[PDB]
Every structure is written in structure tokens, then in C-alpha cells.
């Protein structure tokens, strides 16, 4: 259905703007909380044949700290992303000075694309994302406490204060939904703030493995 797909794409973009806000990227407030009618008026309401196609929804944004660090939010046409389309998207990635990007897939892409992703890791950090995953924001669930990515200096201060090792901390998987949400790599630490009925609130830290 046309309206159903328009709504799904709008929700995908809303979750992506929330993602970019959480990651520390300069997102305009109006686009951060735009209505579905705003999306329909802006983009054309007809993804079946009209103007709001996936490539018309590509999002670019830069980090608040340095304008050089930009993240790209891609949207391929095909459900199963093959090597050719990620290759041309990576050529677009080459021609600009961007460093890292995102890919939003309706259907699982070919495994060879994932292996290409794994091998091209040092040059650029591209991340995939199933459309179903981004169809709803995950940080707003009652079960999920707030997650804060902490900087290298903060981690060193923590490690020195508690006089413990890097491996002695609790752990989070790299493929974890919230770890993928914040786009944090191996060795990165995320502090978790949760409220407790015994102490009011509690802070825990988790290394990424």
C-alpha cells in the first residue's frame, strides 16, 4: 500500500534523526520532530512511482564537534543489497571527504556484502541496518535505560579511580541493538544510568566486545 509505505519511510527517517541526535550530530529541531503530514508534503506522498523514492530520502549530517566528521544515511532501492550497489555507494563515499556512513536495508543483504563490509572497515566505517530495526526507536522503551557513550579521557579517569583493568568491566556485544544504535566499536565504553528501587539510581559501565 502506498500510504503504508509512506508512513513506514517517515518512521524510518524519524528514528534516523533521533539516532543522529543521540550520536551527537547537528539535527534541526523541526526535522527531529516533523509530522507525518510534514513528511508527505515535503517528499511527495507516493513512493510507488512518484517522487519520494529511497535515493530522494538520503540524509547527510555532520558531527557537532568537528564539521569534517560527517555520517551518511543511505537508502537503497533493492531489498537485497548486492555488491554492485554498495560499490557505487562507496564510490560516492570516496568522492566526498566523508568517513563513516549508514545503510538501511528492507531485506537482508547478500553475505558477500557483509564480508566486503568487514574487510573495508579500516578505510571507512559503514554500518547496515534492517528496516524493521529502525522502524521504531529503541531508546524510549521502558526496559532500556539511557546509554551514554563516554570519551577516552573519561574512561581513563574511571579506570584509574576504580583501579581496575579494561577486561574487568562488564561487557556489551558489538552486535547489541543499543551498541549498534550508538555505533560504538571494540574497546569503547558506554555508561548506563538506570533507576533502582533500592538506591534511587545506579550507574554501570560496559566495555564493547
Amino acid at each position: 500500500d502506498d500510504e503504508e509505505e509512506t508512513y513506514r519511510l517517515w518512521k524510518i527517517r524519524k528514528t534516523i534523526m533521533q539516532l543522529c541526535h543521540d550520536r551527537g550530530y547537528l539535527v534541526t529541531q523541526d526535522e527531529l520532530d516533523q509530522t507525518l503530514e510534514e513528511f508527505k508534503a515535503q517528499f511527495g506522498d507516493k513512493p510507488s512511482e512518484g517522487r519520494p523514492r529511497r535515493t530522494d530520502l538520503t540524509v547527510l549530517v555532520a558531527h557537532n564537534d568537528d564539521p569534517t566528521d560527517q555520517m551518511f544515511v543511505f537508502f537503497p532501492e533493492e531489498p537485497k543489497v548486492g555488491i554492485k550497489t554498495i560499490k557505487v555507494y562507496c564510490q560516492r563515499m570516496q568522492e566526498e571527504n566523508i568517513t563513516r556512513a549508514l545503510i538501511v536495508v528492507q531485506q537482508g543483504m547478500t553475505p558477500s556484502a557483509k564480508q566486503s563490509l568487514v574487510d573495508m572497515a579500516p578505510k571507512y566505517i559503514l554500518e547496515q541496518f534492517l528496516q524493521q530495526e529502525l522502524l521504531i526507536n529503541i531508546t524510549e522503551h521502558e526496559l532500556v535505560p539511557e546509554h551514554v557513550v563516554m570519551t577516552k579521557e573519561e574512561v581513563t579517569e574511571l579506570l584509574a579511580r576504580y583501579k581496575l583493568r579494561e577486561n574487568q568491566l562488564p561487557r556489551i556485544q558489538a552486535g547489541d541493538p543499543v551498541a549498534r544504535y550508538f555505533g560504538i566499536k571494540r574497546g569503547q565504553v558506554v555508561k548506563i544510568i538506570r533507576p533502582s528501587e533500592t538506591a534511587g539510581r545506579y550507574i554501570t559501565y560496559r566495555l564493547v566486545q
Binding site: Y162, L164, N167, Q168, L169, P170, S196, T198, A199, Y202, I203, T204
Partner: peptide
């Protein structure tokens, strides 16, 4: 010596 909790009952 892996950390389970920074405080036992969290307090």
C-alpha cells in the same frame, strides 16, 4: 575479579 556490581544492593 570481574565487576558484578559497584555496590552490592546498588547502595
Amino acid at each position: 575479579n570481574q565487576v558484578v556490581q559497584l555496590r552490592y544492593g546498588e547502595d
